[PDB]
Structure 1
Amino acid sequence: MKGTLVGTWIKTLRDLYGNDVVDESLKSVGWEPDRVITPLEDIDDDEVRRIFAKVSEKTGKNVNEIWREVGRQNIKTFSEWFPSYFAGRRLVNFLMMMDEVHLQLTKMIKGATPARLIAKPVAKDAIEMEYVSKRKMYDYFLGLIEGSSKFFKEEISVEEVERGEKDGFSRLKVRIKFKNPVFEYKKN
């Protein structure tokens, strides 16, 4: 994972579980307890795994729950570090533009296999959003959606439609329903 996101995860873990737990978890994988991860770095995904496993150990929460909580709270971290993505927007357009935003952030990467966050209207008050990747961050994804709702103070209902791994390509499809009609048939 590119250092840009990993840096936010570290801060977010601190907001959730405290500096003590995070310092100890970082040290447990050989990092300096106050390591600042930058955009120029590429963090080994298995190192991230072990950090999260230590947090699970110290907090007594299942790692799935930790990812959910991190997703939820990481939205606030994003809003502080990169307020530009939030300013002058409402939830529906925010979710709608996530795919584009991530494509911009991943346009340069070596992997050449872009995770996708395609959203599309399926009713006057609902979208389907599909997470497609090789990494299978199911709980993180669900958490980010909740965190978005929380941040924008707009209530939604989320129903999981599909989740499964095909050829390494993990997919998670959700239906998100809003409190007000937001879409209408126009002529393709």
Structure 2
Amino acid sequence: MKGTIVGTWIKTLRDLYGNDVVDESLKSVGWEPDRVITPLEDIDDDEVRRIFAKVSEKTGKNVNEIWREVGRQNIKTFSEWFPSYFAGRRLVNFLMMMDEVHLQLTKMIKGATPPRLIAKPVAKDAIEMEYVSKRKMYDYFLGLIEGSSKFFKEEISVEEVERGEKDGFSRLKVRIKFKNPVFEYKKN
């Protein structure tokens, strides 16, 4: 996982659960007191998994619940640490940009396997977004969408279309419907 993104999770975990939980959890995987992660650094996925496992053990919360709350709260962290991706954008623009953003931010990681997040308009007031990744981080994905709606103050409904796993890739396709129309028909 891209290191500075793991950085946002650590910060979001402190917001949710406190510095003691997080400090103890980072201690258990040997992290310096207290490390600053560089933009080129990759952090091993299994190290992330062990950090979150320690948070689960100390808080008593299931790891999937933690990932969901982290996704919900990490949009705010992103707005602080990566503010250029926000900057007056509308929610639908933000969501439809995510696939390209994740390709850009992992371009110079070796064996980079960013999630794919392709969104396509399906109605004047709706997009379909399909998560595709070997990591199967459904709760984080769904939590980011919910946090995105709160942050942009645009009400959405999220309905699952389908999910699957083939050849190690997990897929989750959701239909995001906006209360207000966000698209118009134009001649192709």
The normalised TM-score by structure 2 is 0.94
Does the CA-based 8 Å contact 2:40-2:109 persist in structure 1? no
1:18-73 C-alpha deviation (Å, 9 max, x unpaired): 10110011112222352222223221111111110111111111100100111111
CA distance in 2, matches of 1:43, 1:113: 13
1:57-93 C-alpha deviation (Å, 9 max, x unpaired): 1111110010011111111001001111100211111
Percent identity, aligned pairs only, is: 99
- Structure 1 residues without counterparts, runs of 5 or longer: none
Of 122-131 and 37-46, more deviation after overlay is shown by 37-46
After TM superposition, what 4+ stretches of structure 1 lie above 3 angstroms from structure 2? Answer: none
1:118-151 C-alpha deviation (Å, 9 max, x unpaired): 0011111110001111111111100110110011
Q: RMSD of the TM alignment (CA)?
A: 1.4
Does the CA-based 8 Å contact 1:7-1:38 persist in structure 2? no
Number of positions where the alignment pairs a residue of Structure 1 with one of Structure 2? 188
1:153-179 C-alpha deviation (Å, 9 max, x unpaired): 111100111222110111111100101
Cα distance, 1:12–1:166 mapped onto 2, change above 3 Å = same
CA distance in 1, matches of 2:62, 2:151: 25
Query: Per the alignment, in what secondary structure is the counterpart of residue 84 of structure 2?
Result: helix
1:95-126 C-alpha deviation (Å, 9 max, x unpaired): 11111211211222222544211001111111
Query: Per the alignment, in what secondary structure is the counterpart of residue 121 of structure 1?
Result: strand
- Structure 2 residues without counterparts, runs of 5 or longer: none
Aligned to 1:56: 56
CA distance in 1, matches of 2:115, 2:27: 30
Of 22-31 and 105-114, more deviation after overlay is shown by 105-114
Does the CA-based 8 Å contact 1:67-1:139 persist in structure 2? yes
Does the CA-based 8 Å contact 1:99-1:117 persist in structure 2? yes
Does the CA-based 8 Å contact 1:115-1:132 persist in structure 2? yes
